[PDB]
Design a protein around this nucleic acid. Structure first.
Ligand SMILES: [Mg+2]
Ligand SMILES: [Zn+2]
Lengths: 163, 620, 49, 1061, 46
DNA sequence: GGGCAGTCGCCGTGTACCTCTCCTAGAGCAGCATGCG
RNA sequence: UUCAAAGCGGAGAGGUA
DNA sequence: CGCATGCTGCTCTACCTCTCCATGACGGCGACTGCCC
């Protein structure tokens, strides 16, 4: 609800919603990072702050689509902020009707099940639900990232197998 | 240049399922259908001709051998026998061929009916309870309400309601032409075939354009599902099964216990139940039995196929010999002990061993001690190659006999085989990347692995019962990469924070503290002047000064004392402009408005030892 | 131990695809780093951060 | 030490089963009648005519059979109308018998039935608090066997009832359906307006509609019936065959609710329900005499042992038998029948066999030494069929309750997933006939302890209103309590009172701990975690070649050894006339002869020796109760698990680092810490459809250089030394293919050697029973002697573990001011951070005892007599030893426990004196000969084609996913890919890699592993259309589906990698 | 006899707090202001 | 219709290694030991 | 010319780090 | 002197239904359900 408060304030004050989304996400990100680091430092444990920043940006990088103007985006879909922004810009450059959106906070388990590869998600949790949804949508997996080249037996795209 | 680029998934049509099985033969008929529930012959350990282990369908049991034994030899390639029609080829093809079972009555797939989202209910605009009642023969459904007033499309009737409607339709008095059809079976195929996705999508969009309230999310879900089916070019009625496939027989094998008893799988029981019920229902349909028994058979067949696909999801679990559930097809893939997490994301490997660890001092970091009984086993192919090339033996069999006989030359070869070959060591709960490291092995005598004391905190190891696992790399790339990226002598800092990770920890810090401390008693030889540090060390080594005495040494360099007085003291302006400033721990003597002439430091022989050791290590 | 292991597995699966592919995105945004202090006392100095 | 028989739970339970446990179940089922009521079967279950066992205990052990008896019950068949009575005796089953030590012998293995701690039957009240609502109270009524009942109070003041797991319903329906008018339920209740509110809100019910509604709610979908509801209630609560409170359930109900119902009636009645409702109302209204219950209290928990569990199994089998009898009796119209031909004992035999062989309450015995054996029979478990489950047990069940005091040990538990779920009975505790644990106390009158008045046993609930003092309080003449303030316990709290106001005193200071923890001297100077470690590790020691008593024992050693039944004491008070390694004879004063036979080099469940040796000589005067022979883990009378060795506390040159141990070479050539281990091998000759199997020495493809030690019958000879890969028994099977036999004779597994000591063999046509289809059985026993070596685990009694890392020649060890080299050097870094201060006390007292030849005994908690008793005693003993010996270097006043030590390599003394003493150390069962394994290539799994797992079958090491993550973090790509494919399941790349390595070429690129193809087939079999595709190069071409299951290279692909030649 | 009421003056956090923070769950505290303003009347009513 | 409290059911809960035990019911059919006149 | 006869799945109980 | 009957080993196949096998775990999230406007 802190995210909603910030988004509403910045939408009432600022004009464009892109900057409101960015500022709201920035403030929530800072709060989360500081809270986790404080909890760890209460004991005698020290970790660098990049390690927590990498994890936290995986939770605050999506948006919920509302009233898509003319793109192929029904309400209720979760999409990356950058993709939505680029599509809206390229569509409204000619003068079309843009789409609305609202930032969301996901979590560490709900975000791992929203990946674009069904092989990674089926091997984590809830295999039958993921496989049924993928079968209905007719999804295809292009084998990018770890945990999918390991299953087939290929060189991982990191390290000495980068190129 | 790779074989494939991506993986795609979709719904299976009956044509595809029949095409997976149903291979052809150089005759006028196809073979790939399972028709009888027999698995194996009791008298002789052979499979039957039409069953879960048949040889006409799944391939021969013994390579280049036919069922009747008439054919043999690898000369016979791609030619089928005549007395029994079994193709002659390798037996490995047995874990490829599939086959299929043809159902006498359609059944519904339980994944698409009983799910957290149910897709049949969403597509048909009906609640899950109504669809579940129409299936399993609990109610009826109206397919055509034509020429009536109180009947609507997709309305659930009942036995008494159907009887009372029959009392009017069968009178045929008037106003009831165009007999309405009701059907107490599934009839889901007819309801799903009646779908007209394009105009349904158009109507749904037209309705969703106007008015929202707060509960248009249902229409949004329906539109999403309809659009998925339109885009994929699938048919919804494929969610109701008409044929099913059968897994190849080596993935459900028969194993023999010690006492001669058989331990068959759980899939064979489920397949047997399905086949038996299907055959019984077909037989009943042939004789034109009363319908009230045919419906019971159909319901039982539905429950059997459902229990094969997924056990205990909708109804009651099927128990086997004991009161324990049987393992279905979904249990193979879904769990923590399923295929994904047990066989694909982690496996068992060759050229590996395990043993207890003890402490080895006098080892250098990047070295480990490997027992002589494990090395001769993990390094066998390299030993054989070296025996063949140098010390010309002959063939591989002679080399293996030489190893078995325990010739003295074996250890001489092994010692030069293993030098320059790194080895990877691992401990059980690998919590970070420093739980696996590479070392260079040294052959030791005994049955325990020797570990350097300076790597214990990284492994979190301890010498009270811990055990370690050993793996070896085979190819040139693995060896170069283990030497250049994982060797234990290049792991100084930690990746979580840049603090050092290889420091003297327990008994070395105590020794350094004792050596470099101070002692008010036991101060023989205090106040003696030495030239350079080596003289002081030589005077201490042959007992003439204590380890804790206070001595003056001549040292031109940089000093760092504790409890120091940064302000100069006892400045004595001597003759000729020479000034000798005397501090608490130094005796610098400086020239007149110039540079430094000499310096002396008051210290302890143990401190001289410590600092000389560090400087010698750095300069050499 | 079970709670710690489950948490680590979830963390690994959420963030497995973060690999370094680019040299520079060319931006001008960042955050403000300051010392971590409990009012009068400081807990983590700015130089360590 | 007032200690009675330590293993008495098992004996009492089995005696109860034999006396009145089988009778009660046999007589509760006897009158079996058919539906016409013409024939009756009566089981006069009072005689049982038990037949004597056909085999002794030793014969059963050595034959690998079962020790049991046969049960025969007399029955009579009565025909109505026409008078016809037939009498006979029917065979019921085989009952395994309990040996003299409290254990069972099933299929030649020793087994023990574990005791189970469960919740007692009765009525339990609880108060639950809503998020925003008031406090609401519920009550649960739980029987021994049957349906459960639940009452609940709502937020508006309404009373609801739940039966089993049906829907909730107002209490008025249940009370009217039971047959109670308004006036009596108004009078019995104490506050009738509270129930009057429910009456008004829910409407008055008459009997007819009460049963109507009860039937409607219990069994929906059926037409209601009055008789239906009546029968449903009668079957639910009032049927002896379907409902049972038990004796304990009736006792608890009467005790809590204050009723007066008879003890013989064991089913629910109306007064119990009325009283439960009244108690709930009073608890809601805060009457004053009502209180909620605690479920972890030891007054609400019970113990079940072998008698009750066997009774339940017998009951189930008897129900099945009655079903069979009723089905079979009516199939014949004409009688032509006898009671023998009517009963079938198969279901009862099957039930008993399943209970004793395949249950999870019957467990394989722990038999490493007598202490482990003794403590395995006194164990209490909270898991099993009728208790808890591992995923459901939480923080509250694994804790220590204040009611465990003197009944369950607070120290001895496992570490890991089983911590707090298995416990051990305390030293003085005993279980009464209801199933509750008791403990003894002495009475205190006017501050005087009456140590001559028969201590009283009291349960947890009884001793809550009394003020009970601990067992360490000091009295002056076994009389008045000294001091002015005394610690007491009142209502589970610790307070202090004047010693004219205490009521009871505990018997002994060790009443709170178990038997394993009672053997640790100077325990009050140790931490609790290390005490747990030491008590657990004392039960993993190995019996040694020549045992030896401790010098600083605690006083309980002679009692912990008398229960294993391996020490022989003379009952005679006479003379000894014949002594031998296998026989002893003692003659009384004209009182005949007593002869004993001794077991020699037998084998335990864990492959350890079970020898027995005599102590006495011929013509010796012997008194009654004197030890005559002793076992393999006892010195004269008492337990002896370790040895006394010289120890010094100091660091060596890095060999003591982090729990490692440095020892001397004297412990190897003096045969200290050497043990005997015996193994058993078995081969079976069966018959096949192709033909039978023959045991003979005519083995094909073998030379006479490998048949030296066979006895021209195909079986090895006694006294032969067998190394690895040696034939023991030669067998040939009739293969089908000239010579048609194949060789699969059994050989010793890799890594085993020793002497052959026994070749006992059994066959048909000789009176031996064999499994079906088999002709003969051959068993071979092989023994070996193992010495201490680098990699073995050593331990002490105070929790100090270690692994041996070096064995120094005796001229390198540090030595004393008399020239004696030390035996072991221990690191002092491990003492202060773990707080084992008692080991130093033990070392110093052992030093004094060795110098005096004294063998002291110290009991735990010894500071009630002085301020610092242990230090003063140790200092006085050391000073006395110094004065008696005459050597001044023994004891110094400046550094009491420290003396000077020299360097054996250079001869120079160390800078400061160190602590030396005599320590009692033990050798554990974790030896490095059983932990080393290696593999290059071997068998593979059938489905996945991955290497097998297991030391006994040439298995591989698992590379889990955490190691995969670690290799991914390093940037490794080629090591990982080589591990995943070429070394695991790339069926064609394995042979190519091996041949390339042998030939010296480069290893070729891998392919797709087999597990991925297996997964694709499994997913296709679920009606999923999954495939792999290759993208199209040009624009409008279609993507092409790639066929994985088709090798393109027509080259050899064997199942296992093979060497080319 | 009685049940006295009093106010005591009285924190460390561990794994549950970290799991709750990383999974973005809903705790039960911390009423949050929604609009800027500049005055906070406590309004101790009757 | 709108809006619920309240309730029912499914998902999830550390890694590596070692030792021991046991593993489908019922019915049908054929050949050998036992008490009696 | 051929290889070739030693490997098997599940459930329960306990232990070491 | 010989004749009639119970016990044991092997073989061969087929499966559904209950009085339900339990009613001491805890959190999260989605889909029915009765009740009050
Ligand atoms: Mg350890
Ligand atoms: Zn043929």
């Amino acid at each position: 609800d802190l995210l909603e408060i910030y988004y509403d304030y910045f939408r009432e004050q600022l004009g464009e919603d892109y900057e409101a989304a960015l500022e709201s996400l920035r403030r929530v990100q800072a709060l989360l990072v500081n809270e986790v680091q404080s909890v760890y430092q209460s004991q005698g444990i020290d970790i660098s702050d990049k390690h927590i920043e990498v994890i936290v940006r995986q939770m605050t990088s999506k948006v919920r689509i509302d009233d898509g103007g003319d793109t192929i985006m029904l309400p209720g879909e979760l999409h990356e902020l950058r993709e939505v922004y680029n599509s809206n810009n390229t569509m409204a450059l000619t003068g079309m009707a843009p789409a609305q959106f609202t930032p969301v906070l996901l979590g560490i388990t709900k975000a791992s099940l929203n990946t674009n590869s069904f092989i990674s998600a089926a091997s984590f949790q809830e295999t039958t639900r993921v496989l049924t949804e993928a079968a209905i949508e007719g999804k295809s997996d292009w084998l990018r990232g770890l945990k999918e080249n390991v299953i087939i037996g290929r060189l991982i795209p990191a390290g000495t197998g980068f190129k | 240049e790779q074989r494939f680029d991506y993986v795609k998934i979709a719904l299976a049509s009956p044509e595809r399922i029949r095409q997976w099985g149903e291979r052809t033969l150089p005759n006028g008929q196809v073979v790939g259908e399972v028709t009888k529930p027999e698995t194996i012959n009791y008298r002789t350990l052979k499979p039957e001709m039409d069953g879960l282990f048949c040889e006409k369908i799944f391939g021969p049991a013994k390579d280049w051998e036919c069922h009747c034994g008439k054919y043999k030899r690898v000369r016979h390639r791609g030619i089928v026998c005549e007395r029994c029609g079994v193709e002659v080829t390798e037996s490995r093809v047995r874990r490829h061929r599939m086959g299929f079972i043809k159902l006498a009555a359609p059944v519904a797939h339980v994944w698409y009916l009983k799910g957290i989202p149910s897709y049949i209910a969403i597509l048909l605009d009906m609640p899950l309870r109504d669809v579940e009642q129409i299936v399993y023969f609990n109610s009826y459904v109206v397919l055509n309400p034509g020429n009536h007033s109180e009947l609507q499309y997709k309305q659930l009737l009942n036995e008494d309601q159907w009887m009372e409607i029959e009392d009017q339709i069968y009178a045929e008095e008037s106003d009831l032409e165009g007999i309405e059809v009701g059907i107490g079976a599934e009839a889901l195929q007819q309801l799903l075939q009646d779908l007209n996705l394009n105009e349904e999508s158009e109507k749904l969009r037209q309705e969703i354009a106007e008015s929202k309230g707060q509960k248009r999310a249902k229409l949004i879900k329906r539109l999403r599902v309809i659009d998925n089916f339109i885009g994929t070019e699938s048919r919804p009625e494929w969610m109701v099964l008409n044929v099913i496939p059968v897994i190849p027989p080596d993935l459900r094998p028969m194993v023999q216990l010690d006492g001669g008893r058989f331990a068959t799988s759980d899939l064979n029981d489920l397949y047997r139940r399905v086949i038996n019920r299907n055959n019984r229902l077909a037989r009943l349909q042939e004789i034109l039995a009363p319908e009230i028994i045919v419906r019971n058979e159909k319901r039982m067949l539905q429950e059997a196929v459902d229990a094969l696909i997924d056990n205990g999801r909708r109804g009651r679990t099927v128990v086997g010999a004991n009161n324990r559930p049987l393992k279905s097809l979904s249990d193979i893939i879904e769990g923590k002990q399923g295929r994904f997490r047990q066989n694909l994301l982690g496996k068992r490997v060759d050229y590996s061993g395990r043993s207890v660890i003890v402490v080895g001092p006098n080892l250098k970091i990047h070295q480990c001690g490997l027992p002589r009984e494990m090395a001769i086993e993990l390094f066998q192919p390299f030993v054989i190659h070296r025996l063949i090339k140098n010390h010309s033996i002959n063939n591989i069999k002679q080399a293996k006999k030489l190893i078995q006989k325990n010739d003295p030359l074996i250890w001489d070869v092994l010692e030069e085989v293993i030098e320059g070959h790194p080895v990877m060591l691992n401990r059980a709960p690998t919590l970070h990347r420093l739980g696996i490291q590479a070392f260079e092995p040294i052959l030791v005598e005994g049955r325990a692995i020797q570990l350097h004391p300076l790597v214990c905190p990284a492994f979190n190891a301890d010498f009270d019962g811990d055990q370690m696992a050993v793996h070896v790399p085979l190819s040139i790339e693995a060896q170069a990469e283990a030497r250049m990226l994982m060797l234990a002598s290049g792991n100084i800092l930690s990746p979580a924070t840049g603090q050092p990770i290889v420091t003297p920890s327990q008994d070395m810090v105590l020794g350094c503290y004792y050596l470099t401390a101070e002692n008010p008693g036991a101060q023989k030889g205090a106040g003696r002047y030495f030239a350079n540090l080596e003289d002081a060390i030589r005077a201490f080594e042959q007992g003439s000064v204590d380890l804790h005495a206070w001595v003056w040494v001549r040292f031109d360099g940089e000093v760092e004392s504790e409890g120091e007085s940064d302000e100069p003291e006892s400045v004595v302006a001597a003759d000729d402009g020479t000034v000798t400033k005397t501090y608490r721990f130094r005796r610098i003597r400086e020239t007149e408005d110039g540079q430094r002439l000499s310096q002396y430091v008051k210290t302890t022989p143990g401190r001289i030892l410590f600092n000389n050791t560090v400087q010698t290590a750095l300069i050499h | 131990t079970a709670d710690s292991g489950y948490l680590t597995r979830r963390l690994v699966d959420v963030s497995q695809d973060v690999i370094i592919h680019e040299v520079d995105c060319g931006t001008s945004r960042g955050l403000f780093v300051e010392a971590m202090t409990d009012g009068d006392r400081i807990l983590i100095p700015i130089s360590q951060r | 030490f007032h200690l009675p028989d330590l293993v008495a739970i098992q004996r009492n339970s089995f005696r109860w089963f034999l006396e009145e446990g089988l009778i009660e179940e046999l007589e509760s089922f006897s009158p079996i009648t058919d539906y016409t009521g013409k024939l009756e079967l009566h089981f006069l279950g009072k005689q049982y005519k038990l037949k004597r066992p056909k085999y002794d205990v030793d014969e059963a052990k050595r034959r690998d059979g079962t020790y049991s008896v046969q049960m025969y019950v007399p029955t009579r068949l009565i025909n109505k109308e026409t008078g016809e009575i037939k009498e006979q005796e029917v065979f019921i089953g085989d009952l395994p018998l309990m040996t003299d030590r409290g254990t069972f012998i099933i299929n030649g293995a020793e087994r023990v039935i574990v005791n189970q701690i469960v919740r007692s039957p009765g009525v339990y009240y609880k108060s639950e608090r809503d998020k925003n609502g008031r406090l609401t109270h519920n009550a649960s009524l739980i029987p021994n066997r049957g349906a459960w009942l639940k009452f609940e109070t709502d937020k508006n003041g309404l009373v609801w009832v739940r039966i089993d797991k049906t829907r909730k319903l107002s209490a008025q329906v249940l009370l009217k359906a039971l047959g109670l008018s308004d006036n009596e339920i108004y009078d019995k209740l104490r506050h009738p307006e509270y129930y009057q509110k429910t009456i008004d809100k829910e409407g008055q019910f008459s009997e007819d509609e009460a049963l109507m509604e009860l039937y409607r709610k219990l069994r929906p979908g059926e037409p209601p019936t009055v008789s239906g509801g009546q029968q449903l209630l009668e079957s639910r609560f009032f049927d002896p065959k379907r409902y049972d409170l038990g004796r304990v359930g009736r006792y608890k109900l009467n005790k809590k609710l204050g009723l007066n119902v008879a003890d013989t009636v064991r089913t629910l009645t109306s007064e119990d329900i009325l009283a439960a409702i009244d108690y709930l109302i009073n608890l809601e209204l805060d009457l004053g005499g009502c209180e909620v219950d605690d479920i972890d209290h030891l007054g609400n928990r019970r113990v079940r042992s072998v008698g009750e569990l066997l009774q339940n199994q017998v009951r189930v089998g008897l129900n099945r038998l009655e079903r069979i009898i009723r089905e079979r009796m009516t199939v014949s119209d004409s009688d032509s029948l006898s009671p023998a031909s009517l009963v079938n004992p198969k279901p009862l035999v099957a039930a008993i066999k399943e209970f004793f062989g395949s249950s999870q309450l019957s467990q394989f015995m722990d038999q490493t030494n007598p202490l482990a054996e003794l403590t395995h029979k006194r164990r209490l478990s909270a898991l099993g069929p009728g208790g808890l489950t591992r995923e459901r047990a939480g923080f509250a069940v694994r804790d220590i309750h204040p009611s465990h005091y003197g009944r369950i040990c607070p120290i001895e538990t496992p570490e890991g997933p089983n911590a707090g779920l298995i416990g051990s009975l305390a030293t003085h505790a005993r279980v009464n006939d209801y199933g509750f644990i008791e403990t003894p106390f002495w009475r205190v009158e006017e501050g005087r302890v009456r140590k001559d008045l028969a201590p009283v046993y009291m349960t947890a609930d009884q001793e809550d209103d009394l003020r009970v003092a601990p067992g360490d309080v000091a009295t002056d003449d076994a009389g008045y309590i000294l001091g002015t303030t005394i610690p007491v316990r009142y209502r589970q709290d610790f307070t202090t009172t004047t010693p004219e106001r205490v009521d009871y005193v505990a018997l002994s200071p060790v009443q709170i701990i178990s038997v394993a923890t009672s053997l640790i001297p100077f325990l009050e100077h140790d931490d609790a975690n290390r005490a747990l470690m030491g008590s657990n590790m004392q039960r993993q020691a190995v019996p040694l070649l020549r045992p030896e008593r401790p010098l600083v024992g605690t006083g309980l050693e002679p009692q912990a050894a008398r229960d294993s039944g391996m020490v022989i004491t003379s009952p005679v008070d006479g003379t000894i006339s014949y002594v031998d390694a296998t026989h002893i004879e003692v003659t009384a004063d004209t009182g005949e002869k007593y002869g004993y036979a001794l077991q020699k080099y037998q084998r335990s469940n864990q492959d350890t020796c079970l020898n027995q040796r005599p102590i006495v000589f011929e013509g010796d005067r012997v008194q009654r109760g004197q030890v005559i022979a002793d076992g393999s883990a006892t010195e004269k009378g008492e337990l002896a698990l370790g040895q006394n060795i010289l120890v010094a506390y100091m660091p060596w040159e890095g060999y003591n680092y982090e729990d490692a141990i440095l020892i001397s070479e004297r412990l190897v050539y003096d045969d200290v810490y050497t043990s005997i281990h015996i193994e058993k091998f078995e081969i079976e000759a069966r018959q096949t459809k192709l033909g039978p199997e023959e045991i003979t020495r005519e083995i094909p493809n073998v030379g006479e250089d490998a048949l030296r030690q066979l006895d021209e019958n195909g079986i090895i000879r006694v006294g032969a030394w067998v190394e690895s890969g040696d034939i023991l028994v030669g067998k040939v099977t009739p293969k089908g293919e000239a010579r048609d036999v194949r060789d699969n004779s059994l050989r010793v597994p890799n890594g085993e050697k020793g002497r052959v000591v026994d070749v006992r063999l059994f066959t048909r046509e000789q009176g031996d029973e064999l499994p079906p289809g088999a002709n003969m059985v051959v068993r071979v026993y092989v023994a070996q002697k193992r010495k201490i070596q680098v990699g073995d685990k050593m331990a002490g009694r105070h929790g100090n573990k270690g692994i041996i890392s070096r064995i120094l020649p005796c001229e390198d060890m540090p030595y004393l001011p008399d020239g004696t080299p030390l035996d072991i050097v221990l690191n002092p870094l491990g003492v202060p951070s773990r707080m084992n201060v008692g080991q130093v006390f033990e070392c110093m007292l052992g030093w004094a005892g060795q110098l005096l030849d004294a063998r002291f005994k110290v009991t735990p908690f010894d500071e009630m007599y002085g301020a610092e008793a242990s230090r003063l005693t140790v200092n006085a003993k050391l000073s006395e030893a110094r004065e008696q010996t005459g050597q001044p270097w023994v004891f110094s006043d400046d550094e009491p426990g420290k003396i000077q030590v020299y360097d054996g390599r250079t001869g120079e003394p160390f800078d400061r004196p160190v602590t030396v003493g005599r320590a009692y150390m033990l050798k554990l069962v974790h030896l490095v000969d059983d932990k080393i394994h290696a593999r290059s290539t071997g068998p593979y799994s059938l489905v996945t084609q991955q290497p097998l797992g297991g030391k006994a079958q040439q298995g591989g090491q698992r590379f889990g996913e955490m190691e995969v993550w670690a290799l991914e973090a390093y940037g490794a790509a080629y090591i990982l890919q080589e591990l995943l494919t070429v070394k695991s399941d790339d069926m064609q790349g394995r042979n190519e890699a091996l041949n390339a390595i042998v030939k010296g070429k480069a290893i070729p690129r891998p392919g797709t592993p087999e597990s991925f193809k297996v997964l694709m087939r499994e997913l296709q079999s679920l009606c999923l259309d999954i495939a792999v595709y290759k993208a199209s190069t040009e624009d409008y071409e279609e993507d092409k589906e790639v066929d994985l299951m088709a090798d393109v290279n027509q080259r050899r692909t064997p199942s296992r990698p093979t060497y080319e030649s | 006899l009685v049940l006295l009421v009093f106010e005591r003056a009285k924190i460390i956090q561990g794994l549950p707090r970290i799991e709750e923070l990383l999974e973005a769950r809903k705790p039960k505290e911390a009423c949050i202001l929604a609009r800027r303003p500049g005055v906070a009347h406590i309004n101790y009513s009757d």
